[PDB]
Structure formats: C-alpha cells, structure tokens
Amino acid sequence: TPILRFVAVGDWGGVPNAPFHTAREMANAKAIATTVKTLGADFILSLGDNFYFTGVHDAKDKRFQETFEDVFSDPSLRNVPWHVLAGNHDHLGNVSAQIAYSKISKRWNFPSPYYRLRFKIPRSNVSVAIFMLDTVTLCGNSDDFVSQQPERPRNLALARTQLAWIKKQLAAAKEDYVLVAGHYPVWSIAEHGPTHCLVKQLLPLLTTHKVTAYLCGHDHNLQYLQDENGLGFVLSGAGNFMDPSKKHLRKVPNGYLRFHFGAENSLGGFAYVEITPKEMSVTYIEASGKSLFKTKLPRRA
Numbered sequence: 343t344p345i346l347r348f349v350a351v352g353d354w355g356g357v358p359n360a361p362f363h364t365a366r367e368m369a370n371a372k373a374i375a376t377t378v379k380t381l382g383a384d385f386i387l388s389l390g391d392n393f394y395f396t397g398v399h400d401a402k403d404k405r406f407q408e409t410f411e412d413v414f415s416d417p418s419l420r421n422v423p424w425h426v427l428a429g430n431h432d433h434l435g436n437v438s439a440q441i442a443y444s445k446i447s448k449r450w451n452f453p454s455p456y457y458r459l460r461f462k463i464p465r466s467n468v469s470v471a472i473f474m475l476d477t478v479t480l481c482g483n484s485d486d487f488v489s490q491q492p493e494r495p496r497n498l499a500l501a502r503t504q505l506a507w508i509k510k511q512l513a514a515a516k517e518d519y520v521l522v523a524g525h526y527p528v529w530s531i532a533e534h535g536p537t538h539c540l541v542k543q544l545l546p547l548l549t550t551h552k553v554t555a556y557l558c559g560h561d562h563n564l565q566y567l568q569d570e571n572g573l574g575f576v577l578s579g580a581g582n583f584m585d586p587s588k589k590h591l592r593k594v595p596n597g598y599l600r601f602h603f604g605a606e607n608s609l610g611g612f613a614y615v616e617i618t619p620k621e622m623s624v625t626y627i628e629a630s631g632k633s634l635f636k637t638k639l640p641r642r643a
C-alpha cells in the first residue's frame with residue numbers, strides 16, 4: 343500500500359539554561375528515533391515553540407546545535423527532513439534567523455513564516471497538501487499580553503495578508519488530503535484553550551474548504567478533537583513539557599474532545615501520521631513508547 347509517513351511534534355524547544363534541553367525533550371528525541379527506525383518517516387513537522395523561552399538571536403545562535411541538532415542526533419533521525427513553523431516563544435526572538443538557518447542545516451526547512459508543502463504518495467496519484475501557518479503573526483504573540491492569549495496581531499498588514507493567502511490557497515487546493523498546521527489551537531481543553539482568533543477567522547475556512555485536519559501545539563499535552571462535520575484537530579504539544587490542565591474543558595463544544603493525555607508525570611509524546619490512498623491515520627505515542635490512541639480520517643471527496 344502506498345504510504346506517506348510523518349511525525350508531528352510540538353513545543354520541543356528545550357531551555358535556555360545549560361544543558362539546553364529537558365529530560366522530556368530527550369525522551370521524545372529517543373522515542374521519535376525508535377518510531378522512525380521501526381515504522382519509517384518521510385519527514386518531521388515541528389508545530390512551533392522551537393527554542394524556549396525567547397527563541398534565537400540570529401542564524402549562528404548556538405541554540406540551534408544545543409537544543410536541536412545535538413538532541414535529534416540518534417542515527418535513525420540523521421537526514422530525516424524537518425518542516426518547521428514558529429510559535430510564540432520563537433517570536434520573542436528572531437524568527438528570520440530560524441528561516442535563514444534553512445541555508446545552514448540540510449534537514450531544517452523553514453522557507454518563510456507561512457508556506458505550502460505538496461507531496462505525492464509514492465507509486466500512486468494521491469496527493470497531500472500541508473499549509474504551514476504563522477499563527478503568531480496572524481493572531482498576536484500570547485507572550486505580549488498578561489492574559490497569555492493572542493489578543494490582537496502586532497501588525498495588521500501581516501495578519502490580513504496571511505489570512506488572504508490562506509483563503510486563496512484553501513479555495514484552490516485540489517489535493518486528496520489537505521492539512522493545515524499552526525502553533526496555536528483552534529480547539530483545546532487545556533491551559534490556553536481555544537484561540538478566539540482562529541475559531542473566528544480560520545475555522546470557517548477549514549470547514550468551507552473541506553480540510554482534513556488542523557494540527558497544532560501550544561497546549562503542552564496530547565489531544566484529538568473532531569467536530570460534527572468530521573474535521574479533525576490533532577494537538578501535539580508535548581515534546582518538552584506536560585501540563586495536565588483541563589482549564590478550558592467547558593470552552594470546547596461538547597463531544598468534540600475524543601482523546602486527551604496530559605499526565606503530569608509523563609515524559610510527553612507526539613503524533614505519528616500515516617496517509618495512504620485509503621485514509622489518513624493518526625497515532626498518539628507517549629515518550630515512553632506506548633501507543634495511546636489511534637484514529638483515522640477520510641480522503642476528501
């Protein structure tokens with residue numbers, strides 16, 4: 343069966359004090375390496391918060407080696423490409439530096455704040471589009487507000503331009519599977535909860551244009567949510583931290599939550615996505631190696 347395989351990991355960005363990683367980040371690096379070795383991966387998606395707590399200063403920042411390259415260094419992961427987007431902490435520093443780092447590290451691919459990826463499932467005519475968004479420039483930086491919510495964008499032109507781009511791209515996308523990814527959640531039951539900006543501006547487009555799933559991090563846990571139209575919400579924000587909060591449980595429409603794992607003494611985890619001509623599958627994997635939940639999502643008509 344033709345297949346495209348990828349890991350989606352969020353909020354993995356270590357720490358700025360020595361040794362520049364956490365035990366959770368290392369456990370996820372090892373667990374991801376084991377998953378790649380045993381099941382395979384064509385690429386890894388980062389769902390943002392790549393360098394805690396204030397990003398990187400420029401493209402030569404030692405954190406690229408300390409928190410990224412040296413951490414994800416097990417043999418099975420050498421040469422697996424990453425496709426990256428930014429979170430709020432990245433935007434407290436220099437995101438242009440993370441984009442420029444694409445020219446330094448072969449496996450790091452981050453061409454602009456938001457961009458389109460297209461894949462053909464090998465030995466099939468089935469196609470996949472992934473739209474990588476910058477939810478910080480769209481909605482604001484949550485760290486700019488005492489509320490730790492993205493109350494408004496810093497720059498109106500950047501936000502309006504990205505929204506227009508999303509709309510145009512989603513209206514034109516002909517692919518068999520269409521995924522959208524961004525740092526902040528549409529829906530989440532946890533410490534930050536739903537992002538009002540995305541519920542208002544992005545979700546109507548995901549629905550109208552029959553997107554398969556929206557992938558995100560930002561809340562430091564694992565969740566699968568699904569609305570009554572079958573649109574999936576893959577929340578994978580557990581590469582470095584585990585927050586057991588259910589603070590926003592009642593702010594998500596009843597029944598949307600299908601799976602949640604946030605145990606405070608867990609090492610975290612990630613999502614593993616498999617796309618075939620038959621369906622898309624998502625498996626949530628704890629950093630201890632345990633498979634926690636698996637679900638499938640359909641092809642677009």
Ligand SMILES: *[C@@H]1O[C@H](CO)[C@@H](O)[C@H](O)[C@H]1NC(C)=O
Binds near residue numbers: 438
């Ligand atoms: C951000 O990083 C880029 C790439 O290294 C650099 O050219 C630019 O000067 C940096 N910006 C600031 C404000 O440091």
Ligand SMILES: [Fe+3]
Binds near residue numbers: 391561
């Ligand atoms: Fe985070």
Ligand SMILES: [Fe+3]
Binds near residue numbers: 391429430525560561
């Ligand atoms: Fe975040």
Ligand code: NA
Binds near residue numbers: 376379416418
């Ligand atoms: Na390995």
Ligand SMILES: [O-]
Binds near residue numbers: 429559560561562579
């Ligand atoms: O986050």
